[PDB]
Design a protein around this ligand. Structure first.
Ligand code: DCT
Ligand code: MG
Ligand code: MG
Lengths: 983, 363, 357
DNA sequence: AAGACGAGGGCCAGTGCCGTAC
DNA sequence: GCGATACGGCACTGGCCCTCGTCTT
């Protein structure tokens, strides 16, 4: 009720828009495809009084919302644009706080630069960071320079107080702060860490550059290489995200000089004061260049991104807020402890193996070792120069008692010892590494004159290249090797020749111990090359490899390590345990710097909600604080968020060490976070782009009908329907599908599905070939399919027809290619044109995949922005405290309070409904299916995580530590209306 | 189960043949050799460092071996419990606070009528009821961490979570001997029962300031058998397939290793400026590093003999003084972990040893 | 008035009737306080250090407490005599050699009669009969000097000579209190009769090599008391002032640091820093910065002087600017000021400067 | 006695492979 | 014709350059 999926809506009375011919085509298509076995399972319709609409459509609704949200900031931006500039001061004031430079650059001591808008770039001495040290900010009126409290030499104690720069004005509109990577500067703002607030938003020239004239990483690689027929035309129309480069692009003036000494990151606080004036000058140059860049970008961005939803969305997407406490510090300590322990064990075992294998140097018995014969095995004993002389060999030159009368003979032997000691020093010069030990052992040791010297062979690894060959047995064979690739593995007769000969002089090789090792292995070039395992003699060549890259070292083959082949020796379960240890510390190894240095400001009891103090939590002399994620508003592509730490934050896995990082963001007492993850966005996006193209309805496609048919709760989604084939649930099937939409390469899908399902390649190939039915078919000498009914002809001039390309049957890649063909905007809907570097006008373009992905992911990001502005609209309109946003692409979580959580979740549901209805309206019809209108899962709890139930590794007991639980949602939240008076 | 000969030959234990696993696990052994009591000495010292010194609120306690009112003490927990009030006074009633003591305890054993003694290191941790379990898990992880280091294969040391007959939580620590796991340390949470029974009159002298309020202390307790632990490290030090070549050597941690370095005389014979060995000797012992003297000898044999002799004594390094070193000043050095000849300078050798041990204490 | 400042400063255990000198000299206790325990540990450490420098080689051992045949030990001789034949292998029968050990021996103290404990340090030196007396005199001098080094007065320690039909020559080290000179250490020259009683026969194992000569060794019995020695140095350190000037290398707690400025977290941070730094180099530091009130300075100094603390450190608010810290000596009571960075080196150099004989 | 070629080690950026998220 | 957008890590390496050594004038 009706039309195979719709709800009670007041978003337009008319309407059909029947398209009887089109729906006959669609029905016939879906019959021959064929799907005509409807389950007839109507989802429970919801009857609630919707929030007031402003008319006429929801388009003007979101437009007026986005405009009324971004109007003051646009005004401030315009104030920055028409700003007439007063020149830089002749000298910078060496005074704490802000210094205003107005007429002739006079120094006027100010606490807070009262301005509507300003550019900003903070400085911070990395030597003892991360506390601000300098800052410069220009305004449409005059100049400003802020100096930190680091003007007096003291023995400071840094617990990250409210020492960051003060920028906001007190009440008892309003603000806009622009800057290159403005999030970093925002992180150094005093009033941004407060639980409440804030009016001040931020605009990023880097993100804006990315929106206007951005380029992919693959482009960045060959862009900087400038130092594929028409692939170099966009080279001068775009640039990298660097400030100097983006200024050279948008301003095109003289090249701005950068600090040659890198004093802020390389030097101490001492050499900063010595060059204070110069550093201040450089900072001023930075804020000036950024000012210019902004001035030239704002109208360009306004042109390229005309819809205000993108603007306001980018405004709210830049003020993220992560509340934390002492549990953060405890987390750091415990995680680093566990990491150091596991690393200690691993390095202990490996250095043990490296110690007990060092003994077979005497005498020349290392050649017999089938693993250790490539390396050095050097024996050095240098050196000395003659000074003593002459002409005599220096190489050869039971009594019971109780005497003590020689009391001071000990000081005689002591004096002789010292006098002997002091004479040898001028014989050697510089202390070299231990020459007695072999070279492989020398390299595997820390230098003697190193401040971080540890005894024995350190620097063992995991993932080094010496140590795995040092101990491991090799796939039903004996030797591992490396050259262009390590020991081959994972990611009509064929024959090859053999050859053995002797010349010299080259390292001896042994091929018997290998065969004997194989004998011992089976005691329990050809043949045995395809499925079994063996090693030849010399060559070296492929002779039976599947992967085209190699893998040093086998670090994710636990199922191939815990099934016999392959194993290690000596010995036992040491191998799989070592792999386990590696897998445990894999995350924290490549992240610990980003989380340990992840700064955080603590707000004292003087500046926190007293209503939270009233709440029965303090907690026991506990410290409350927060950290702003420091997120670049728009990083390619499409204008997605970019953040070094939190966007690549691992999930709740009981295997990884720091896997609790996601769930360490704990809400303050009285507060709780409510969020949701769109399920699913890009899939339904491609679906809609298909059905809306084919006809009017949403279920008029072979692919688009299955997307809006499944429910995750006690049911089966499309991903889940592909995962139960079988099939692997569920993220893997997601990768397979989303990989299929953007290029289901036969060998890619092959080794992928084969990697995930773990079976034999033939049956797998059958599965792929069956699943390859979706992209089929497609289009002098050519592919045997054209617009003509048959390809065969004689002297038939048809160069005018070879201009159409389109797949057939199930999928709708034709529409994505249709958006990928237009030489102009290519923006659906909304609605923002990207990259002067990918716009096919004056581009070859050969960047197709990136642009299909651009289209769908753009729909995803505009979905994100729509969600942001929608959530913001009914959060200020109604009494829902806590408007702070924390978004991760698909997912988005707000920091609400315990008494306004269900209404906030209701706001999330309304938001999702309105956004889906927007995507439906931009293509028609305004009508939308049932199992896609509302969210299925709304997370509501203290710390943010994935599933409502959460286990972890390091703390071992989650609720053991001061925690709570989560709640699935749901249908029970659809009883609390947006009005304050509920329950 | 054949390293015992290495323990007899090189006295880390008694030369008596009757040293069964039962006689070693009961404490009815005739005693330990000098190298053994030295190993246990460094082990107990390493305990005292990583339990008492670095952690504040922990003070040494001296419990007697008997009672004023014949059988001796079974555990040195109660003797430390008797010292609760004064130690409360020296901490200004600031709990959590602990009392630590390493003393030999006497256990009655019916051999299937005798009594066996064994050195035990005990810490009694007086902690508020609000945070009892937290401190229990704390000490669990930390003790287990302390025992899982110094080991060549830390996998052998395990922990077992167990409850009492009434319901009191507790944790045991095991070491995987070649014949199975064996108890080496125990951690229990005593719900202020014994303290209540010891002071029935005025319980006001038991109240400890938890912070904003004075509460009755819950008595955490950790007791570690250092004899079974010394034997555990003894077994762990010794080596196991397709190595193709084997040498008898036990790999003890450089921190707890009985004899650190071994000084000898090479080439040999050389008279009579050999008094420099005495210099290096006193210089070495002055820095607190163990040095074995290879002066008066009957061998006069293959170097492999005394090299293996030192490897059986877990000696870290073998410093060799020869007449060429008497000329220039560069003595020989053979490491234990990696049997390899290496040249070095004298004071450089001293500082190398000090830095070696000190850094071995670290990561 | 010394026994009372050992009760309030936790050198001895809490007692009200068994606090007398007679009950202290007796093994009966009221055990020991943390300060006394650390003092005994440092004393025993210096004891083991003053015999490890002794050439050629003396092996440490441990003896059982109860009876092997079913009782508690009185002396620390038998257990050392049981490990003689074994250590013979380790000395390779080459020369005279000794066995040192520190243990808690017992003795009956006299209603009913009880049992007292004492921690004694013994050294059993096996030496040829012809060179036993000379070595006994050697150990006499070395032990006397050992007591003399940490002594505030060498005249307080004395050495007496004696002899009998069972022991041909012996020496006993006394200590003047001066409420009465008391036994502190015994140095006897027992024959092989003690050893020939537990190994007959066939006594062919007992005789060690002595310059191509086989000879059953005479047994030197060193037996010192570390408890009586502890009390000795306690009475040796007692000097309106009431300050115990124990030896720097002997003092249990050698430094203590508090705060002066009103209770601030930063002060505790700095103090924890100095705490860790000083403990990193093996320097016992008393934490009085906890604190909680920091009432007075004079009574605090009195407390730290009754605990024999070498130096007291004060971390004011100026330290959070210039790094300067308020040092205060004990032997001179000079209120000094020095940078916090140069404190470790100063204390270490000061302790190392007390290393002389 | 001064000058020039040669060998060893630190600092640098570049590259290959692995690791996480959506 | 095709995984896509990021984000970092460590292991390895060829190259610039200072330092010490050593042969040469
Ligand atoms: N390997 C991936 C993972 C994700 N995405 C894109 C596609 C969708 C978008 C959001 O990611 P997910 O939420 O993980 O996909 P989903 O289908 O929405 O999953 P769910 O139904 O659980 O929300 O990111 C992608 O392109 N490639
Ligand atoms: Mg999703
Ligand atoms: Mg997602």
């Amino acid at each position: 009720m009706l039309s195979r999926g719709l709800h009670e809506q007041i978003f337009g009375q008319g309407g059909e828009m029947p398209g009887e011919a089109a729906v006959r085509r669609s029905v016939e298509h879906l019959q021959k495809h064929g799907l005509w076995g409807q389950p007839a399972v109507p989802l429970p319709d919801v009857e609630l009084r919707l929030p007031p609409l402003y008319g006429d459509n929801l388009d003007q609704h979101f437009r007026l919302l986005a405009q009324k949200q971004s109007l003051p900031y646009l005004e401030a931006a315009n104030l920055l644009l028409q700003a007439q500039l007063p020149p830089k001061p002749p000298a910078w004031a060496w005074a704490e706080g802000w210094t205003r430079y107005g007429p002739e650059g006079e120094a006027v001591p100010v606490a807070i630069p009262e301005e509507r808008a300003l550019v900003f770039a903070v400085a911070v001495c990395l030597a003892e960071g991360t506390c601000p040290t300098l800052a410069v900010a220009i305004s449409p009126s005059a100049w400003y320079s802020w100096c930190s409290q680091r003007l007096v030499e003291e023995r400071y104690s840094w617990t990250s107080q409210l020492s960051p720069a003060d920028l906001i004005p007190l009440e008892v509109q309003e603000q806009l702060v622009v800057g290159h990577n403005v999030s970093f500067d925002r992180a150094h703002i005093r009033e941004q860490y407060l639980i409440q607030g804030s009016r001040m938003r931020f605009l990023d020239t880097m993100s804006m550059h990315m929106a206007i004239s951005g380029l992919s990483s693959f482009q960045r690689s060959l862009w900087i290489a400038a130092k594929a027929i028409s692939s170099w035309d966009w080279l001068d129309i775009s640039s990298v995200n660097s400030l100097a480069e983006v200024h050279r692009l948008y301003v095109g003036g003289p090249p701005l000089e950068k600090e040659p000494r890198e004093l802020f990151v390389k030097g101490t606080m001492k050499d900063i004061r010595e060059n204070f004036q110069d550093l201040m000058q450089y900072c001023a140059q930075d804020v000036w260049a950024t000012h210019e860049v902004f001035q030239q970008q704002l109208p360009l961005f306004l042109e390229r991104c005309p819809h205000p939803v993108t603007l306001a969305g980018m405004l709210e997407m830049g003020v993220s807020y992560l509340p934390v406490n002492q549990n953060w510090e405890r987390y750091l300590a415990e995680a680093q402890g566990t990491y150091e322990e596991l690393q200690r064990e691993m390095k202990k075992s490996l250095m043990d193996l490296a110690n007990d294998a060092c003994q077979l140097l005497s005498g020349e018995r290392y050649k017999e070792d089938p693993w250790l014969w490539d390396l050095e095995w050097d024996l050095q004993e240098f050196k000395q120069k003659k000074a003593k002389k002459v002409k005599k060999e220096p190489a050869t030159a039971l009594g019971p008692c109780s005497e003590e009368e020689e009391f001071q003979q000990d000081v005689m032997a002591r004096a002789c010892l010292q006098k002997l000691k002091g004479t040898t020093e001028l014989l050697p010069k510089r202390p070299q590494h231990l020459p007695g030990h072999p070279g492989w052992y020398r390299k595997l040791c820390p230098r003697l004159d190193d401040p971080a010297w540890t005894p024995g062979p350190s620097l063992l690894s995991l993932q080094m290249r010496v140590t795995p060959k040092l101990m491991a047995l090799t796939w039903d064979g004996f030797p591992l090797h490396y050259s262009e690739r390590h020991g081959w593995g994972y990611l009509n007769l064929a024959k090859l020749p053999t050859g053995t000969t002797l010349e010299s002089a080259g390292v001896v090789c042994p091929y018997r111990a290998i065969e004997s090792l194989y004998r011992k292995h089976c005691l329990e070039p050809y043949n045995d090359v395809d499925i079994p395992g063996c090693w030849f003699f010399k060559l070296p060549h492929k002779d039976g490899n599947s992967c085209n890259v190699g893998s040093p070292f086998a670090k994710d083959f636990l199922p191939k390590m815990e099934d016999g082949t392959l194993q290690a020796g000596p010995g036992g379960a040491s191998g799989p345990r070592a792999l386990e240890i590696n897998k445990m510390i894999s995350f924290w190894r490549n992240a610990h710097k980003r989380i340990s240095s992840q700064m955080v400001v603590w707000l004292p009891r003087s500046a926190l909600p007293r209503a939270v103090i009233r709440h029965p939590d303090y907690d026991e002399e506990g410290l409350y604080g927060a950290i702003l994620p420091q997120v670049v508003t728009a990083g390619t592509i499409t204008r997605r968020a970019v953040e070094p730490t939190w966007l690549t934050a691992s999930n709740a896995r009981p295997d990884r060490v720091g896997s609790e990082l996601k769930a360490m963001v704990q809400a303050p007492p009285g507060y709780t976070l409510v969020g949701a993850d769109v399920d699913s966005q890009e899939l339904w996006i491609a679906a809609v782009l298909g059905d809306a193209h084919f006809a009017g309805m949403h279920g008029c496609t072979a692919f688009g009908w299955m997307t809006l048919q499944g429910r995750k709760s006690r049911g089966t989604d499309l991903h889940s329907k592909t995962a139960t084939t079988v099939g692997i649930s569920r993220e893997h099937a997601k990768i397979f599908n989303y990989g299929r939409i953007y290029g289901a390469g036969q060998p890619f899908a092959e080794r992928l599905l084969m990697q995930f399902n773990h079976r034999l390649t033939q049956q797998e190939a059958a599965e792929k070939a069956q699943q390859m039915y979706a992209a089929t078919k497609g289009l002098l000498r050519k592919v045997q399919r054209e617009t003509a009914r048959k390809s065969q002809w004689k002297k038939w001039e048809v160069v005018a027809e070879r201009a159409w390309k389109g797949g057939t049957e199930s999928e709708m890649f034709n529409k994505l290619e249709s958006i990928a063909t237009s030489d102009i905007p290519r923006t659906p809907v909304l609605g923002c044109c990207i990259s002067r570097a990918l716009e096919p006008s004056a581009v070859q373009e050969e960047f197709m995949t990136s642009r299909v992905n651009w289209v769908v992911q753009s729909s995803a990001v505009d979905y994100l922005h729509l969600m942001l502005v929608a959530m913001k609209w009914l959060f200020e309109e109604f009494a829902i405290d806590g408007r702070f946003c924390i978004s991760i692409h698909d997912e988005v979580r707000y920091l609400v309070r315990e008494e306004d959580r269900y209404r906030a979740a209701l706001a999330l549901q309304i938001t999702n409904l309105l956004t889906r209805c927007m995507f439906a309206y931009k293509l028609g019809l305004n009508d939308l299916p049932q199992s896609v209108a509302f969210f299925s899962a709304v997370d509501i709890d203290r710390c943010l995580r994935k599933e409502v139930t959460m286990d972890c590794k390091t703390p071992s007991n989650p609720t053991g530590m001061e925690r709570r639980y989560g709640i699935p949602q749901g249908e029970a939240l659809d009883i609390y209306q947006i009005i304050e008076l509920t329950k | 189960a054949l390293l015992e000969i290495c323990q007899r030959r090189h006295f880390l234990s008694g030369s008596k043949q009757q040293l069964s696993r039962d006689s070693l696990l009961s404490g009815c052994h005739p005693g330990f050799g000098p190298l053994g009591v030295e190993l246990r000495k460094n082990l107990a010292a390493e305990w005292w460092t990583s339990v008492v010194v670095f952690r504040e609120q922990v003070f040494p306690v001296d419990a007697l071996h008997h009672k004023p009112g014949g059988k001796l003490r079974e555990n040195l927990l109660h003797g430390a419990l008797e010292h609760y009030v004064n130690c409360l006074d020296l901490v200004n009633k600031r709990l959590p606070y602990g009392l630590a003591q390493i003393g030999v305890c006497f256990h009655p054993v019916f051999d299937t009528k005798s009594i066996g003694e064994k050195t035990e290191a005990s810490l009694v941790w007086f902690t508020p009821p609000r945070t009892s379990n937290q401190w229990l898990d704390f000490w669990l992880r930390h003790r287990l961490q302390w025992w899982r280091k110094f080991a060549m294969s830390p996998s052998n040391f395990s922990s077992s979570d167990c409850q009492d007959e009434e319901g009191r939580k507790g944790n045991k620590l095991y070491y995987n001997f070649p014949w199975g796991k064996e108890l080496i340390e125990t951690l229990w949470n005593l719900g202020d029962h014994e303290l209540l029974h010891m002071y029935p009159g005025n319980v006001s002298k038991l109240h400890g300031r938890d912070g904003r309020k004075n509460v009755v202390p819950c008595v955490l307790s950790v007791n570690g058998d250092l004899d079974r632990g010394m034997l555990a490290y003894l077994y762990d030090s010794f080596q196991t397939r397709k190595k193709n070549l084997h040498r008898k050597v036990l790999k003890l941690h450089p921190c707890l290793a009985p004899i650190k370095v071994a000084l000898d005389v090479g080439r040999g014979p050389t008279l009579e400026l050999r008094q420099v060995c005495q210099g290096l000797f006193n210089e070495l012992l002055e820095n607190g590093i163990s040095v074995w003297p290879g002066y008066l000898e009957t061998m006069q044999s293959s170097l492999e003999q005394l090299y293996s002799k030192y490897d059986e004594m877990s000696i870290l390094f073998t410093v060799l003084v020869t007449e060429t070193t008497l000329e220039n000043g560069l003595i020989h050095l053979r490491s234990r972990d990696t049997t390899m000849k290496e040249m070095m300078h004298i004071s450089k050798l001293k500082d190398f040893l000090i830095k070696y041990i000190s850094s071995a204490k670290n990561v």
